[PDB]
Amino acid sequence: NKTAWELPKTYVSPTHVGSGAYGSVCSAIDKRSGEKVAIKKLSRPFQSEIFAKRAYRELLLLKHMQHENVIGLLDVFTPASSLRNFYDFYLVMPFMQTDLQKIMGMEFSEEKIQYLVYQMLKGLKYIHSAGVVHRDLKPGNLAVNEDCELKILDFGLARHADAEMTGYVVTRWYRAPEVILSWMHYNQTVDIWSVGCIMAEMLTGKTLFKGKDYLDQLTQILKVTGVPGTEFVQKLNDKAAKSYIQSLPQTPRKDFTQLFPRASPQAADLLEKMLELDVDKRLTAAQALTHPFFEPFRDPEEETEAQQPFDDSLEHEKLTVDEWKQHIYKEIVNFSP
């Protein structure tokens, strides 16, 4: 279904769940083990260099990643017999149950928020330690089972963090202000901002920053965040970003206690440190785990990190789509005796 799945005989009873033009997600049952799994089809990975490069990133990231709070790769396959008829491929991973977007209407006690956000940051510490930035953390990408176990999903926009990265990234409502203010020069803390936006949403049942376009998102953010002093204005390396700010609509900076009532002094403090405008003052994943807000649940022995840095050897290379296909096809077949 959009566009006609070609599964092996190992996976049976294809029930559909997600949909799109970039490919679909469907549930299936592995016939070897009896486990229920999630299968994601990449239907047009070779339409362009960018789609090909992203397909490669997603596969390798899924492949090399081993953490309780990050989705793992069970299998990957393609109906193709060679590079001559290689048009798409499928990723197989543990089935979950629901995601955080679906249950946002629920009422989240601070205990649940503590537990769930703690798992987000544990996974994020792991992902970041591999030198990777996710760049699309949102409630739809946070899988949750009946035990309130959490897994991070979707590495389609993820990559090895570099000094210069793709500009238009992250889903707008969860997109950090520096993505716009410091175009193409952000770091792993964009993920921390997304975590902040999510936590606030669990706390209220409402999306914190609902901008109508990429610029209005910035305006929404700078309402809660204050308009910075001349210290931060000169702390940037942009003249275009110096403007707009130069329109100085001022009243910095709101206090989160008055802005997030019926939430705990320390919960408000964590949101504040996560939603910090200045990227240097902003909490990292490792640091956020050490915040007093997570004391009832914290266990440093399960805050593991990557055993190996994620390889970025092709990241600074110029491949054709045909070359990307070769590497992808190669990485599909050597998996996983």
Helix or strand (DSSP H, E) at 181? helix 178-181
17 is in an annotated binding site: yes
The residues with which 91 forms a beta bridge, in sequence order, are 40, 76
21 is in an annotated binding site: yes
20 is in an annotated binding site: yes
105 is in an annotated binding site: no
333 is in an annotated binding site: no
- Chain centroid offset of residue 42 CA: 18
Report the alpha-carbon angle 332-335-337, nearest 5.
Answer: 160
25 is in an annotated binding site: yes
Give whole-number Cα distances, 248 to 42, 228, 275, in Å.
45, 9, 20
Specify whether the CB–CB gap between 66 and 334 falls below 8 A: no
DSSP label at residue 290? T
18 is in an annotated binding site: yes
State the burial class of residue 106 (Cβ atoms within 10 Å of its Cβ: 0-12, 13-18, 19+): exposed
- Chain centroid offset of residue 115 CA: 18
40 is in an annotated binding site: yes
Catalytic site residue from 136, 213, 255, 311:
136
State the burial class of residue 326 (Cβ atoms within 10 Å of its Cβ: 0-12, 13-18, 19+): middle
DSSP label at residue 214? H
Residue 136 annotated as catalytic: yes
12 is in an annotated binding site: no
22 is in an annotated binding site: yes
Binding-site positions read: 17-25, 40
Instruction: Report the catalytic residues.
Output: 136
Binding-site positions for ATP read: 17-25, 40
